[PDB]
Amino acid sequence: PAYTNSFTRGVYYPDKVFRSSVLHSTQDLFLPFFSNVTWFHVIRFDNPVLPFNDGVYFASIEKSNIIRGWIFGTTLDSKTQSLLIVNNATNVVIKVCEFQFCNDPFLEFRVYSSANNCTFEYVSQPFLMQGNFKNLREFVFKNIDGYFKIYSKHTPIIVREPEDLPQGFSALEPLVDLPIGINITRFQTLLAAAAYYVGYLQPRTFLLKYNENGTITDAVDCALDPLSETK
Amino acid sequence: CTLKSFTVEKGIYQTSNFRVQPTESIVRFPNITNLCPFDEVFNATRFASVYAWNRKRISNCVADYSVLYNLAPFFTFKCYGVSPTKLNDLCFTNVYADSFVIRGDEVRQIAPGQTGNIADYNYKLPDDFTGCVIAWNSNKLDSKVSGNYNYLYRLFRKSNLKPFERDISTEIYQAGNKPCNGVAGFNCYFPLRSYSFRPTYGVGHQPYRVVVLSFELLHAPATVCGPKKSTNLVKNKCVNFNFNGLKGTGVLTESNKKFLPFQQFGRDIADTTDAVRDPQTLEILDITPCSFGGVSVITPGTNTSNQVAVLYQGVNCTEVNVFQTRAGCLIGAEYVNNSYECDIPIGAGICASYQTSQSIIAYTMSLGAENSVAYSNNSIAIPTNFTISVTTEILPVSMTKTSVDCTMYICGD
Amino acid sequence: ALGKLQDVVNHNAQALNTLVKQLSSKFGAISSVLNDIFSRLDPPEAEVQIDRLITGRLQSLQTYVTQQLIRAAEIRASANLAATKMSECVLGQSKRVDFCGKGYHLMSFPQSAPHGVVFLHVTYVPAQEKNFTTAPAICHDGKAHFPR
Amino acid sequence: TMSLGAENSVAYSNNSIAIPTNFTISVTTEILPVSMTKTSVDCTMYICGDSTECSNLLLQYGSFCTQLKRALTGIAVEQDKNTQEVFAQVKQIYKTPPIKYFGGFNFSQILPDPSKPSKRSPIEDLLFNKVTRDLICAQKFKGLTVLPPLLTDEMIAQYTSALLAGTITSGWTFGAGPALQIPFPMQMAYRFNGIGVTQNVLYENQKLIANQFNSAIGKIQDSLSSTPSALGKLQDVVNHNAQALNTLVKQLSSKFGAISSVLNDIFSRLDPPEAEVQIDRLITGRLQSLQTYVTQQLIRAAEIRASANLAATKMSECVLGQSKRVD
Amino acid sequence: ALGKLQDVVNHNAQALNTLVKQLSSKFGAISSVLNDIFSRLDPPEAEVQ
Ligand SMILES: *[C@@H]1O[C@H](CO)[C@@H](O)[C@H](O)[C@H]1NC(C)=O
Ligand SMILES: *[C@@H]1O[C@H](CO)[C@@H](O)[C@H](O)[C@H]1NC(C)=O
Ligand SMILES: *[C@@H]1O[C@H](CO)[C@@H](O)[C@H](O)[C@H]1NC(C)=O
Ligand SMILES: *[C@@H]1O[C@H](CO)[C@@H](O)[C@H](O)[C@H]1NC(C)=O
Ligand SMILES: *[C@@H]1O[C@H](CO)[C@@H](O)[C@H](O)[C@H]1NC(C)=O
Ligand SMILES: *[C@@H]1O[C@H](CO)[C@@H](O)[C@H](O)[C@H]1NC(C)=O
Ligand SMILES: *[C@@H]1O[C@H](CO)[C@@H](O)[C@H](O)[C@H]1NC(C)=O
Ligand SMILES: *[C@@H]1O[C@H](CO)[C@@H](O)[C@H](O)[C@H]1NC(C)=O
Ligand SMILES: *[C@@H]1O[C@H](CO)[C@@H](O)[C@H](O)[C@H]1NC(C)=O
Ligand SMILES: *[C@@H]1O[C@H](CO)[C@@H](O)[C@H](O)[C@H]1NC(C)=O
């Protein structure tokens, strides 16, 4: 295991409201700046059972198709509900079908534990997924009383020292808002080098500046240092 | 009228504000025709109990909420946050229906605030109640005793429940620190107490099928809404709009904004709706208020004349003789190229007066005469005579002392 | 001319009239009168209406008191200015320009007035001037001579 | 620990006098606010916005829409009067002579410049360049407006030039009564004879006085330079008015105890029997916020009136004559 | 002797005393204790109170 930093990454649009040149501040569930991130090399089976306390900041650095699974669930033995998400070329396979859970999360699709009665499915076409700039892919997750929000933004990243979360502000726009009522409290990745940048979320006031193009340029965390508290 | 008197003095007096009234109404709603099927809802045979809820998150439809008005007798509608008759024009985001067969006079405990046993360890609602509660007498269908074991009822729990949280449990309670290990000993049973029923039972003992469906009014794209129509969309015209429940007035022009595909509404610095997305084909609009302003009347005085002059503050003489100053559009006076002392202050250095027929004239302020005192290298101006003058100054020194009585002014006799 | 004295009187009169008229405006009740409310409704229901009325009336009275305090501060500043003028103009000549009237101050006679004081400043105003050729100094047979 | 100052030790004695041997003419500067930003609110638009029913329910409320407007009008009239009791004390507008040979001085940075179309002085040019959807258009759509002053910049510039052309040509005569032409080397001598110095010092050191005065003007030209903390007393009132107008357009998005913050959502979700219970709390809160703003504006106008009276006293004593008051 | 010096002190003292005493004054409510209103009457009307 290892620990990388979280300088100025983990900011997302809290509400669905366009604002130009404003300074808004909401008590949403953001990622604390300058926090620890459980760096896991999944190159090597790195398959922990990391919890889902108030959200997660899953990120990934790969080449083509290394990490393609974010299966959820809390008591994943025989009966609990889950959220299977693969990123094949056709579309997403978002499911909530409670079924069997195999201890080996290895993947093509090879898990295929058991099929039975389901509650919801999703075959959404807008799938979640230069040469030198391989990929800087991060996926924000959060469990609310209603839908299960998923934020992500695929951006190019330069090559540098051994892979760590780079410095630079980047807002996370939402992609899917599927309704769900799951009681998930864990995490599990699927893959057939890696980052596995898991970062836990917690409530904190975040003053975020909106530009005149409807994009977040910078954001304070109001809890890091007394300077931010004054800001 | 604005100042109660039949004899006004000479000056400028604010009276009202110029405002253009709308002349149309826009009620464009999302084009959708499917109806929410009520077969999988309370209007059905197979019902559920408080042990296992029936939560059906319905999809977009045009279901008219004024359909159950001919339901079974005694159909209470206690909407704690909305209005029952008003559920025909609001567009809700998502409706969360529910179903349970709670029995007894504890129907008042389902409403928020009450802390009864059903509200303690059988059901709970958040302190918003964004929807309504639907409860009716259920006796003709639950008269037989075969539905006793089909209608479950949980028992006390060592911890309070959570709003919108199912309480499915099948273990045995443990009082204190003595585990009874499955077998029911003392102070340890299974929270699966079955409700007892009877055909010829009492009035209060009869069960009641209660529906507590709720909503969520926020910025998310609404899915369900009442059945209404849609009209055309004007651009350069101050009219009324009802875009997706957002009711207001003002012009709806085309905006050159950059609304992201997930951003529907739009606010301003003061958190006011400045732009909205049409529920029809994607088009970015701009909600600007109607053309308003402020009026000001220039009056030379009551018993000196009967003419007035209107001053539309903040107008460019193209939004309402005519004179465009740096303070508004003065309509009723004429700008003379002369210069006199200020008599009626208006703004930007252009006062007015009632001078010679007799009409209200406008003129630039005169700061005074122009004197050119010659300055030479050797020229003194010594006076040769004195003129003693006696001026006067008016300064207040006091004020009328007043006293109030609380027990006589705030409260009468 | 006599407007500074009428100003405070008219302001107080208008304030009193507004405070009296505030008793004829329903702050969210069925009627302005209190007895009709306490007679046509039961205590628990009429309680909300009478609370709204008493809150509105207390707010109006507090606004009146605040306006009266601000006006009293302004009139205290004016009275201090008047006292300074009476002490520097009447009780002795003052070499301050425009203070004891426009021009070279000579005398100041105070007189009573309703809620004020009317001064009578005597000023020396030169007139009928003539142009003359001047010089800083004149030259003697080897020494200078400046005007004393 | 704060340093109260240096540590000087005067040497008192039975027979010891300190008599100066050289003069150092210096020109200081003081900043005094005179006017403010006149404002006017709209009661039927700030409280109720596009909510006609709200206006019909507010009409029942007390006469609070007529006393606040009257207070704002009084404040506006007071602010328009403060620009006349300071910049306008001389009736006749004087004009500077064509030639510029006032003794040996260089009154070219205080006198108006005819080249630029503003008819101001380089010092005034340097001053009017450091004191400042847009926020102005946003506040206008919610009642908050800004009325323009009576006397514009050109009129104030002409008034300042008239108070300056009568101070160079004449001495303290144009202030008391009619203007009397007097040479400037003699006016300065008569002014020096008012502090104790005899007139045998200026006529013998006129060139040195002129050079020191020119150097003082030059140093003043650089004192009001890019250095931000110079015109602080003039930007403070502007920043206070801005933060007051921003705190009032922010109060329109605060729930005073209702289920929402729009006057068009409560009247479209609730019923009339219950509408008059949640729509009145917001109206009461907005009326309280507007009354607080009016009280703050009244206190600010009182402070500005005190400052304007002080500035008028300064203009009357220091400019229109010579004052023997220390500091 | 110190009339104007004690006047401001007495005014500030009176203001602070009034501000600290108006906390035990029911502004049209059942009681003045926050917990008693929050718990001993009802959840719903506790908000209004
Ligand atoms: C967090 O990261 C720092 C720096 O890498 C490390 O020293 C520390 O042990 C980590 N864990 C905690 C709990 O601070
Ligand atoms: C969700 O799971 C957590 C994990 O233990 C549990 O404590 C909680 O009761 C569950 N339900 C809700 C509504 O959070
Ligand atoms: C901001 O929006 C304008 C709109 O025309 C565009 O020209 C400009 O490139 C945008 N700037 C950024 C940094 O997105
Ligand atoms: C129906 O509504 C959708 C929603 O965006 C819109 O794209 C489409 O153009 C509408 N069709 C018609 C015929 O109005
Ligand atoms: C009024 O309109 C004219 C012509 O369009 C324009 O030149 C002028 O700047 C406008 N004035 C204002 C105050 O908008
Ligand atoms: C001076 O003025 C007075 C009246 O103001 C006049 O009677 C007199 O003739 C004038 N000339 C003198 C006194 O030389
Ligand atoms: C001279 O000054 C000293 C103080 O140093 C004092 O003691 C003495 O009395 C003075 N003598 C006279 C004649 O003033
Ligand atoms: C007096 O001081 C000034 C400093 O500006 C200097 O220029 C001048 O020569 C001095 N004159 C004498 C007589 O010391
Ligand atoms: C007289 O004054 C003018 C302008 O003030 C100047 O140009 C001229 O040189 C002066 N002549 C003498 C002899 O001082
Ligand atoms: C006054 O000073 C300015 C400084 O820029 C200079 O240009 C000008 O020639 C000076 N005038 C005289 C009369 O010395």
PDB file of C-alpha atoms in Angstrom, chain D residues 86-223:
ATOM      1  CA  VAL D  86     -18.791  73.455   0.263  1.00  0.00           C
ATOM      2  CA  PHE D  87     -17.983  73.942  -3.424  1.00  0.00           C
ATOM      3  CA  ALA D  88     -20.320  76.921  -3.805  1.00  0.00           C
ATOM      4  CA  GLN D  89     -19.659  79.865  -1.487  1.00  0.00           C
ATOM      5  CA  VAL D  90     -18.604  82.474  -4.060  1.00  0.00           C
ATOM      6  CA  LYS D  91     -21.428  83.737  -6.278  1.00  0.00           C
ATOM      7  CA  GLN D  92     -19.342  85.188  -9.104  1.00  0.00           C
ATOM      8  CA  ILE D  93     -17.336  82.614 -11.062  1.00  0.00           C
ATOM      9  CA  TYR D  94     -13.838  84.047 -11.474  1.00  0.00           C
ATOM     10  CA  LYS D  95     -11.480  83.346 -14.375  1.00  0.00           C
ATOM     11  CA  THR D  96      -7.711  82.994 -14.384  1.00  0.00           C
ATOM     12  CA  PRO D  97      -5.768  85.595 -16.406  1.00  0.00           C
ATOM     13  CA  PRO D  98      -4.293  84.497 -19.757  1.00  0.00           C
ATOM     14  CA  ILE D  99      -0.622  85.006 -18.874  1.00  0.00           C
ATOM     15  CA  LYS D 100       0.932  82.855 -16.132  1.00  0.00           C
ATOM     16  CA  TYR D 101       3.453  84.948 -14.182  1.00  0.00           C
ATOM     17  CA  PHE D 102       2.168  84.811 -10.598  1.00  0.00           C
ATOM     18  CA  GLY D 103       5.292  86.018  -8.822  1.00  0.00           C
ATOM     19  CA  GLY D 104       7.757  83.227  -9.489  1.00  0.00           C
ATOM     20  CA  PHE D 105       5.542  80.243  -8.768  1.00  0.00           C
ATOM     21  CA  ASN D 106       4.259  77.517 -11.079  1.00  0.00           C
ATOM     22  CA  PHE D 107       0.485  77.277 -10.522  1.00  0.00           C
ATOM     23  CA  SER D 108       0.055  74.894 -13.448  1.00  0.00           C
ATOM     24  CA  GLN D 109      -0.940  71.631 -11.713  1.00  0.00           C
ATOM     25  CA  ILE D 110      -3.851  73.084  -9.705  1.00  0.00           C
ATOM     26  CA  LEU D 111      -5.275  75.330 -12.418  1.00  0.00           C
ATOM     27  CA  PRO D 112      -7.508  73.724 -15.065  1.00  0.00           C
ATOM     28  CA  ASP D 113      -5.925  72.418 -18.254  1.00  0.00           C
ATOM     29  CA  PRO D 114      -7.678  73.569 -21.450  1.00  0.00           C
ATOM     30  CA  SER D 115      -5.955  70.902 -23.558  1.00  0.00           C
ATOM     31  CA  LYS D 116      -7.923  67.873 -22.345  1.00  0.00           C
ATOM     32  CA  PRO D 117     -11.722  68.073 -22.826  1.00  0.00           C
ATOM     33  CA  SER D 118     -12.448  67.662 -19.090  1.00  0.00           C
ATOM     34  CA  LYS D 119     -11.274  71.157 -18.025  1.00  0.00           C
ATOM     35  CA  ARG D 120      -9.524  69.909 -14.893  1.00  0.00           C
ATOM     36  CA  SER D 121      -6.043  70.036 -13.349  1.00  0.00           C
ATOM     37  CA  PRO D 122      -3.352  67.312 -13.429  1.00  0.00           C
ATOM     38  CA  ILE D 123      -3.926  66.749  -9.713  1.00  0.00           C
ATOM     39  CA  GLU D 124      -7.672  66.382 -10.299  1.00  0.00           C
ATOM     40  CA  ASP D 125      -6.911  64.086 -13.238  1.00  0.00           C
ATOM     41  CA  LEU D 126      -4.791  61.900 -10.953  1.00  0.00           C
ATOM     42  CA  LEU D 127      -7.572  61.968  -8.327  1.00  0.00           C
ATOM     43  CA  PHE D 128     -10.434  61.046 -10.681  1.00  0.00           C
ATOM     44  CA  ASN D 129      -8.498  57.979 -11.850  1.00  0.00           C
ATOM     45  CA  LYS D 130      -8.076  56.176  -8.499  1.00  0.00           C
ATOM     46  CA  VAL D 131     -11.574  56.452  -6.954  1.00  0.00           C
ATOM     47  CA  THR D 132     -13.951  54.046  -8.697  1.00  0.00           C
ATOM     48  CA  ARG D 133     -24.112  40.597 -16.226  1.00  0.00           C
ATOM     49  CA  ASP D 134     -22.664  43.473 -14.209  1.00  0.00           C
ATOM     50  CA  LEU D 135     -23.682  44.012 -10.593  1.00  0.00           C
ATOM     51  CA  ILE D 136     -25.188  47.439 -11.331  1.00  0.00           C
ATOM     52  CA  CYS D 137     -27.675  46.009 -13.832  1.00  0.00           C
ATOM     53  CA  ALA D 138     -28.436  43.136 -11.450  1.00  0.00           C
ATOM     54  CA  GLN D 139     -29.319  45.415  -8.527  1.00  0.00           C
ATOM     55  CA  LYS D 140     -31.515  47.589 -10.777  1.00  0.00           C
ATOM     56  CA  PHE D 141     -33.931  44.728 -11.522  1.00  0.00           C
ATOM     57  CA  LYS D 142     -34.709  44.494  -7.796  1.00  0.00           C
ATOM     58  CA  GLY D 143     -35.621  48.054  -6.814  1.00  0.00           C
ATOM     59  CA  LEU D 144     -32.137  49.249  -5.879  1.00  0.00           C
ATOM     60  CA  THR D 145     -31.345  52.235  -8.118  1.00  0.00           C
ATOM     61  CA  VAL D 146     -28.722  54.988  -8.038  1.00  0.00           C
ATOM     62  CA  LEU D 147     -29.886  58.543  -8.695  1.00  0.00           C
ATOM     63  CA  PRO D 148     -27.360  60.856 -10.375  1.00  0.00           C
ATOM     64  CA  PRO D 149     -26.069  63.878  -8.445  1.00  0.00           C
ATOM     65  CA  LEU D 150     -27.235  67.406  -9.182  1.00  0.00           C
ATOM     66  CA  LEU D 151     -23.853  69.051  -9.777  1.00  0.00           C
ATOM     67  CA  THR D 152     -21.837  67.118 -12.365  1.00  0.00           C
ATOM     68  CA  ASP D 153     -18.038  66.877 -12.569  1.00  0.00           C
ATOM     69  CA  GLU D 154     -17.680  69.881 -14.891  1.00  0.00           C
ATOM     70  CA  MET D 155     -19.658  72.140 -12.542  1.00  0.00           C
ATOM     71  CA  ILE D 156     -17.574  71.056  -9.541  1.00  0.00           C
ATOM     72  CA  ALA D 157     -14.412  71.646 -11.579  1.00  0.00           C
ATOM     73  CA  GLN D 158     -15.580  75.151 -12.509  1.00  0.00           C
ATOM     74  CA  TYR D 159     -16.419  75.827  -8.855  1.00  0.00           C
ATOM     75  CA  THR D 160     -12.959  74.689  -7.741  1.00  0.00           C
ATOM     76  CA  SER D 161     -11.353  76.834 -10.446  1.00  0.00           C
ATOM     77  CA  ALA D 162     -13.401  79.840  -9.313  1.00  0.00           C
ATOM     78  CA  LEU D 163     -12.306  79.266  -5.707  1.00  0.00           C
ATOM     79  CA  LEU D 164      -8.743  79.104  -7.048  1.00  0.00           C
ATOM     80  CA  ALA D 165      -8.703  82.034  -9.502  1.00  0.00           C
ATOM     81  CA  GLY D 166      -9.954  84.324  -6.725  1.00  0.00           C
ATOM     82  CA  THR D 167      -7.329  83.038  -4.300  1.00  0.00           C
ATOM     83  CA  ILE D 168      -4.379  83.892  -6.575  1.00  0.00           C
ATOM     84  CA  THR D 169      -5.533  87.232  -8.005  1.00  0.00           C
ATOM     85  CA  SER D 170      -7.244  88.391  -4.821  1.00  0.00           C
ATOM     86  CA  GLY D 171      -6.371  87.442  -1.260  1.00  0.00           C
ATOM     87  CA  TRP D 172      -9.056  87.172   1.413  1.00  0.00           C
ATOM     88  CA  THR D 173     -11.152  89.998  -0.071  1.00  0.00           C
ATOM     89  CA  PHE D 174     -13.215  87.938  -2.531  1.00  0.00           C
ATOM     90  CA  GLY D 175     -14.308  85.744   0.365  1.00  0.00           C
ATOM     91  CA  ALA D 176     -15.529  88.570   2.591  1.00  0.00           C
ATOM     92  CA  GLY D 177     -16.834  90.935  -0.074  1.00  0.00           C
ATOM     93  CA  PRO D 178     -15.898  92.121  -3.559  1.00  0.00           C
ATOM     94  CA  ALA D 179     -12.730  90.824  -5.177  1.00  0.00           C
ATOM     95  CA  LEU D 180      -9.755  93.191  -4.915  1.00  0.00           C
ATOM     96  CA  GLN D 181      -6.762  92.740  -7.208  1.00  0.00           C
ATOM     97  CA  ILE D 182      -3.509  92.396  -5.258  1.00  0.00           C
ATOM     98  CA  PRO D 183      -0.070  91.208  -6.461  1.00  0.00           C
ATOM     99  CA  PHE D 184       0.832  87.705  -5.303  1.00  0.00           C
ATOM    100  CA  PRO D 185       4.299  88.660  -3.924  1.00  0.00           C
ATOM    101  CA  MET D 186       2.384  91.142  -1.759  1.00  0.00           C
ATOM    102  CA  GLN D 187      -0.414  88.715  -0.864  1.00  0.00           C
ATOM    103  CA  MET D 188       2.158  86.197   0.369  1.00  0.00           C
ATOM    104  CA  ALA D 189       3.929  88.976   2.289  1.00  0.00           C
ATOM    105  CA  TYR D 190       0.668  89.955   4.005  1.00  0.00           C
ATOM    106  CA  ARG D 191       0.080  86.263   4.782  1.00  0.00           C
ATOM    107  CA  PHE D 192       3.587  85.915   6.261  1.00  0.00           C
ATOM    108  CA  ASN D 193       2.877  89.026   8.354  1.00  0.00           C
ATOM    109  CA  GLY D 194       0.035  87.031   9.905  1.00  0.00           C
ATOM    110  CA  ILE D 195       2.159  84.350  11.566  1.00  0.00           C
ATOM    111  CA  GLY D 196       4.822  86.643  12.998  1.00  0.00           C
ATOM    112  CA  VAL D 197       7.376  86.785  10.193  1.00  0.00           C
ATOM    113  CA  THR D 198       7.983  90.324   8.982  1.00  0.00           C
ATOM    114  CA  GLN D 199       7.672  91.118   5.278  1.00  0.00           C
ATOM    115  CA  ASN D 200      11.439  91.715   5.001  1.00  0.00           C
ATOM    116  CA  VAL D 201      12.000  87.963   4.597  1.00  0.00           C
ATOM    117  CA  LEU D 202       9.846  87.114   1.549  1.00  0.00           C
ATOM    118  CA  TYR D 203      10.940  90.059  -0.604  1.00  0.00           C
ATOM    119  CA  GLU D 204      14.560  89.069   0.098  1.00  0.00           C
ATOM    120  CA  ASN D 205      14.009  85.328  -0.458  1.00  0.00           C
ATOM    121  CA  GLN D 206      11.233  85.255  -3.066  1.00  0.00           C
ATOM    122  CA  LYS D 207      13.062  82.934  -5.469  1.00  0.00           C
ATOM    123  CA  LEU D 208      13.797  80.437  -2.683  1.00  0.00           C
ATOM    124  CA  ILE D 209      10.135  80.504  -1.617  1.00  0.00           C
ATOM    125  CA  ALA D 210       9.059  79.918  -5.227  1.00  0.00           C
ATOM    126  CA  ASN D 211      11.477  77.008  -5.634  1.00  0.00           C
ATOM    127  CA  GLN D 212      10.373  75.408  -2.356  1.00  0.00           C
ATOM    128  CA  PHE D 213       6.717  75.787  -3.351  1.00  0.00           C
ATOM    129  CA  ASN D 214       7.388  74.208  -6.749  1.00  0.00           C
ATOM    130  CA  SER D 215       9.228  71.313  -5.099  1.00  0.00           C
ATOM    131  CA  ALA D 216       6.320  70.887  -2.674  1.00  0.00           C
ATOM    132  CA  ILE D 217       3.845  70.747  -5.564  1.00  0.00           C
ATOM    133  CA  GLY D 218       6.105  68.209  -7.273  1.00  0.00           C
ATOM    134  CA  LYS D 219       6.260  66.018  -4.171  1.00  0.00           C
ATOM    135  CA  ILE D 220       2.481  66.275  -3.768  1.00  0.00           C
ATOM    136  CA  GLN D 221       2.094  65.117  -7.374  1.00  0.00           C
ATOM    137  CA  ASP D 222       3.966  61.942  -6.356  1.00  0.00           C
ATOM    138  CA  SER D 223       2.221  61.565  -2.985  1.00  0.00           C
TER     139      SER D 223
END
